[PDB]
Amino acid sequence: AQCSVDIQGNDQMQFNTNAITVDKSCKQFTVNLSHPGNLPKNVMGHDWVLSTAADMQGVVTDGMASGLDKDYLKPDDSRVIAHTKLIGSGEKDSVTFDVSKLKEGEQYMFFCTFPGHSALMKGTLTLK
Amino acid sequence: AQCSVDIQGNDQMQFNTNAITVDKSCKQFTVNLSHPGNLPKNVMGHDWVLSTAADMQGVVTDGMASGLDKDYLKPDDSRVIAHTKLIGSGEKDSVTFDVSKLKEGEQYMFFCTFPGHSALMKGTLTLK
Ligand SMILES: [Cu+2]
Ligand SMILES: [Cu+2]
Numbered sequence: 054a055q056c057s058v059d060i061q062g063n064d065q066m067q068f069n070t071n072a073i074t075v076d077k078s079c080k081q082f083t084v085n086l087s088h089p090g091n092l093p094k095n096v097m098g099h100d101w102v103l104s105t106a107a108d109m110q111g112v113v114t115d116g117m118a119s120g121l122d123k124d125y126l127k128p129d130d131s132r133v134i135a136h137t138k139l140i141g142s143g144e145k146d147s148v149t150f151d152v153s154k155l156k157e158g159e160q161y162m163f164f165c166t167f168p169g170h171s172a173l174m175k176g177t178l179t180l181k
Numbered sequence: 182a183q184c185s186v187d188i189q190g191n192d193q194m195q196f197n198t199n200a201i202t203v204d205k206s207c208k209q210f211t212v213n214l215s216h217p218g219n220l221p222k223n224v225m226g227h228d229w230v231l232s233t234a235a236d237m238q239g240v241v242t243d244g245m246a247s248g249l250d251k252d253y254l255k256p257d258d259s260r261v262i263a264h265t266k267l268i269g270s271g272e273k274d275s276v277t278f279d280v281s282k283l284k285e286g287e288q289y290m291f292f293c294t295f296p297g298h299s300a301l302m303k304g305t306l307t308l309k
Contacts, residue, residue, distance in 0.1 A: 096224075
């Protein structure tokens, strides 16, 4: 626990939280994602992606343009600090990243890149 | 216009009108739906479905459970007064229903039954 969190994205297009603070003593931080529900990945896919607030739009945009095969993310997009894979119902994925990639005083947002899902599936992350 | 309306569902999960009025003189009424943009049916499908405000949730829940192959609508759902098929970008569909299936003093709702979309895509229909 402490440097980790569990996120669930369901069939009603929602995440279970919209805010995450990362404790400044963490060297690394883990996100674990599971998709409750019965719908397939091609109709209700979810991933947890991270970037600063000012680049979220660019990532969602470039992400949509790359297709379901690239899990709706642009390959080697250097605005994406961290990201999971796109997962369907009953699947799960985890990502660990380096906390020194964040700095205190900058605003970060987590979100899903499936088309349209970022309207309700988005939230803040902050280094405290 | 005269006893019919032309409506659009776009790539942002938005319909372009959110209240429809049906005048009592009309024996029938027609709705013509188009979907501008470029996303396919499985990622951004849309339909126009009508029920009383009371049956919307029962219809939205059963439709999600019917699958993309059943155009996310329960077959022969007795609560649906009228509907179109589920279209992707570039496509189009229309429907004409009898105005005698509506009654004065009841509240009706139109919505898209694609999973996750009916929260953003809905509006009122009133018989005046
Ligand atoms: Cu999603
Ligand atoms: Cu829709």
